Amino acid sequence: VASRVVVNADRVKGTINRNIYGHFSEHLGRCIYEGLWVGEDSPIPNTNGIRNDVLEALKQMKIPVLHWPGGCFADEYHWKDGVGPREKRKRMVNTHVIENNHFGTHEFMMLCELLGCEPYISGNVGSGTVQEMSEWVEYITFDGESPMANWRRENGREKPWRIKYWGVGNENWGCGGNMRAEYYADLYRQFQTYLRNYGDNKLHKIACGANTADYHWTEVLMKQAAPFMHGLSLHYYTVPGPWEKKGPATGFTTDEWWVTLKKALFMDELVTKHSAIMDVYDPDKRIDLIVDEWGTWYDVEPGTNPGFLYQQNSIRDALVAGATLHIFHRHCDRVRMANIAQLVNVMQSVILTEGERMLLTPTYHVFNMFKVHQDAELLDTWESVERTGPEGELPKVSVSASRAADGKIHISLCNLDFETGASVDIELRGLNGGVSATGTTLTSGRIDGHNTFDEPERVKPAPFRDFKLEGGHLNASLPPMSVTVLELTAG
């Protein structure tokens, strides 16, 4: 009983926008402070205050876009508190957490330039003013003379920055103001009016979209505000248990494995149904769907502060990431950005740090393996896959194929069963020449296999050779609980 797949290598169905592989960093826990920002005089080796070990790993992963500063923090942030001389930045210290605002606009834009990624900034609607947000944009982007542009120059950046992605509030249905969609849509329309295109900059204005299955939100924002947006967001976290006892990152049950993956795959139905509503108001698909919060959310590691959201990261997280990325690919006609929550030390991170030490999570390795899909052409594939899990409720395999700019084909495959391997037969159609293939696979011997600071390489990619290629068929034996990428070269 093999899964079967046919790849039509000559039929392109869309472009997988690189920003599908995006990231998110809030001022929360150790995502910004320690995770990225250590300060110029830290003994952790750093580039202008940003730790080198993280920088180098994120560059290798080819981070395309980074969303900052929030999350809920964005609708509480007053950007002027984060610019100017470090010693006059606003300082808050709670003894029950330090926000010293040493990382602000200039440090973020420096971060993005060091990474080679797009900045994606969210302005403050819930507790901010229209002038405040307008002034932020002007500060960043205006090349003339004004109090804001002159301030930016004073603070060390002479020429403006370019920025496309601009979020007009975040989570406005909840921590960003507990707003009705109808009320948010009016604020949105008002705020966005004053966010200008200065110089040769072109803003890509993103309205706050729904939480999970709040389809009414999407309908209202589309019906009332479509002509005034370039994108609409969507938030959906994979939470295995109930809110008050989400379940652990490691040491979990087999039931928790299956439930986690089933909940992750619910993304497909969400994206489908929100997109269907968007199609009614925007049939040409002008407006991007932006899934700017996704990923797993567990109970924090025992003994850690629940407010810091620190969780471990296992092969289970790798499967969530790979299957979710595949869902985004299948919707790349409308989904054009996604941002996993969150970059470092918080929720489903690519990196965890502990002082000067760091590790790469299994989530990191999926992003780094799947980077070959960034800006690739999605190929037409059809499939008939085995089932797995209790009552066959899950697909055993998730597969996606794309063509890179040099003509190579990448086929990525997830085996969602932790107990046995998956046989897959792939037929390749529409090739001219012959092809050869190499592979890499990410797997584990344990259902909760993970990396630690003492053992940072327990779960990492390896060469994959358990396949054969002949007569236009590639037959592969995928390991249990694995993510695999095959690279095909023509000739």
Added chain:
Amino acid sequence: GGCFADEYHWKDGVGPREKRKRMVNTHVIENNHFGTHEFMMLCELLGCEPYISGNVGSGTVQEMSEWVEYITFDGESPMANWRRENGREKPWRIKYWGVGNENWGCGGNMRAEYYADLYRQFQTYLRNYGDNKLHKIAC
């Protein structure tokens, strides 16, 4: 304005003329040398009524309320004291007061129903000081 009215912040146009806000776009210069005092003088020289449009789209309720108070109040307050420091001892009279302009478009892309609510809110705080009587105009 026009569209400028829902972008203007009136405080930028008062005070020592030399130290007012400057903006320049290469791609147009606004030095704010013509502001509230200069406009009110202009209307007095012409013998015409002044008709000012306050900023709803990017302005705040306090900001508009303070504009009216600055112009018209004859007592002691931070705004009236500031007007006197800026060279006008007694208040001016003004009737015609626009509570935003072009709010369906360049003044905030507002639905009528939403503008009506902001209108009701903003106008509440535009007071009749001394013997002045405002004539409030909705967009």
Added chain:
Amino acid sequence: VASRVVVNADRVKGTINRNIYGHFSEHLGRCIYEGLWVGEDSPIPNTNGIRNDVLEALKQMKIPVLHWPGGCFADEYHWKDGVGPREKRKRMVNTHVIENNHFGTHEFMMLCELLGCEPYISGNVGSGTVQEMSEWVEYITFDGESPMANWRRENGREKPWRIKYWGVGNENWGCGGNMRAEYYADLYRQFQTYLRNYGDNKLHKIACGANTADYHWTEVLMKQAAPFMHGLSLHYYTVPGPWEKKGPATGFTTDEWWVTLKKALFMDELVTKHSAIMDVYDPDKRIDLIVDEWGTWYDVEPGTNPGFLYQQNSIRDALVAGATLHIFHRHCDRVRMANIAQLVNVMQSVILTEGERMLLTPTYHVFNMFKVHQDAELLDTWESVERTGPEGELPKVSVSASRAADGKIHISLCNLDFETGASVDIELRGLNGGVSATGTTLTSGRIDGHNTFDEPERVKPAPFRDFKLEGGHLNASLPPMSVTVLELTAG
């Protein structure tokens, strides 16, 4: 410059419900009287009062479903007027048109049995009562004792008939009561409640849907009445000129050719957008979309009564029909019935009669050539086609492929350009064996080529041989202004 197509012969995309090839006959002009019903002692040869020449032609075409009695007539009809001793039924005559009610329920049900087609009756909401409609269903379908079933037996039909398709009013936004969607939805819910399933009969209840681009109607009916319907209708006529001067059926300009075809192809946008709204409320596509009025609508033939809607029928009509049917195929995941307006002597008919004489229109020949698509499996095809018309506004070629129950493949092609032939290269993938092909084509030497009673065979199907099949490519040279079907057999 060939159009190119690839057929994936092993990939099925859906089932083309046979009812896509449906028809519609209203009590209007000579559609029912003379067109079908001649009376038992007419010198026109007949079977139980229905003319044999039409019967035989419709059976050969494999008519799958016939909608009666309207149109606007349905929301004026009182069915009890059409049952009982034929001689004593209601008579109306307008001098300023005769309705003797000799064709009523028994005659219609007999007609469908003789044809082997499903009956599709529209009940009267606009001027009818809930009891009246409920009694109609009971009269037709109930096998016990009751006043209605006893009456049917007295009128000569002992056992009940079966009927699936039941329209709960027609054109209720216009001639069926000038209703707002919200008000119609409420009447719909009320009327349908009383339409019972008697014996082993199962009704398929159809709500009146939108006229043309009235998307609000579809939204309201889906949101308020989806759980109470099996199907929702849609109406769209191709009208070349303005309402008051639509343009003629023959002797038209080349501009009228292009405008006609462009307007016809607007069906795709309509069906797409109405279907998108349906998907929001019915994501599993339970509810059928029924396009129960479509076709061309011209000024009547000079000197004929405008109220009788008699128009000629040319190769231009054949192209409208073939391109429209192809649009329905591409939407066969949701469109499950369609009904061209109207069957005989009215609008875009398959047959025109003049006393005992009859002719087959070019529209007939499309339906008869495309019957091979009835209940077939739609195959995955992709294409890149030449453009035609002023400014390349039209596709030069429309193509569709399906697989019949015996494994043959039919590929139909329309060439929309009247000026030159169309080269097409078709690649066949996913076959095992070799294949051979035969073809038929329908074309004319004039842009308004048509059949007349004196020359009833000027435009009719002919063998098509101008193609070659080698090395899994079928290259064809389609004639100008043509509709062609290729039949492929494996081995």
